[PDB]
Amino acid sequence: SSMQFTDKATETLNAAAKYAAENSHVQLHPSHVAVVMLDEENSLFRSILEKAGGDVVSIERGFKKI
Amino acid sequence: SSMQFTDKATETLNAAAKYAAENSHVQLHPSHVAVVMLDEENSLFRSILEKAGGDVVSIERGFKKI
Amino acid sequence: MVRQPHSPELAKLLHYAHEHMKKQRDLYIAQDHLILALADLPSMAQVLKEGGVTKKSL
């Protein structure tokens, strides 16, 4: 078994650990990844929600409550 | 010094470097050359020991401990 | 094989092959997927470690 990462997904995984440590948390919830990944210039995730339907201003608001 | 190699000699030294990857090694030690030659059926190193009267089992154990 | 009398032990071997299928990025299951499944079994990993192939060397 082997695990190989890229460049865009690598910086997002390392950024999720720093966000959970600066807010005094215990577990690494998966909701701490989509927030940092969305805040990117010309990100690939922004065009997904705008193509398959759904407003991008209401989905992100539901991640901060978690 | 002019240390030219033949076609058969390059096939052994190049295979000895890749042979140490499976045995967890980070260096090319000369003791790995005799191990690769003994793992091949009907090799040149095995035919020499049969004419000089030498046990191939005791020799393989010596290079394995190093 | 002598100690042992669909097989119940075969169900665990086929279940481990599905886990390795989602590792090497292969949509199907070939011969290489069944090789790593034998090392996960506690009653089968001792045979591979007897000759001279440990967990890191495998």
Secondary structure of chain B in the HEC alphabet?
CCCCCCHHHHHHHHHHHHHHHHCCCCCCCCHHHHHHHHCCCCCHHHHHHHHHCCCHHHHHHHHHHC
Q: Is B19 exposed, middle or buried (0-12, 13-18, 19+ CB in 10 A)?
A: middle
User: Which among C35, C57, C58 is the top mutation candidate for probing chain B, defined by the most B β-carbons within 10 Å of its own β-carbon?
Assistant: C57
How many angstroms separate the CA of residue C55 from the nearest CA in chain B?
Answer: 11
List the resolution, Å.
4.0
| Position A36, amino acid | V
C24 contacts in A (CB within 8 Å)? 2
Suggest the residue from B19, B23, B39 to mutate for an interface test with chain C (most C CBs closer than 10 A). Answer: B23
Cα angle B33, B39, B34 (rounded to 5 degrees) comes to 20
Instruction: Kindly tell me the burial class for residue B10, based on how many C-beta atoms sit within 10 Å of its own C-beta (0-12, 13-18, 19 or more).
Output: exposed
Identify all chain C residues contacting B65, using CB atoms and an 8 Å cutoff. none
> Rounded CA gap, A16 and A9, in Å?
11
Tokens representing B31 are 């003791």
Contact C33, C21 (CB under 8 A): yes
Method: cryo-EM
Helices (H) and strands (E) in chain C, counts: 3, 0
SS3 content of chain A, % helix, strand, coil (to 5): 55, 0, 45
B&C contacts, CB < 8 Å: 4
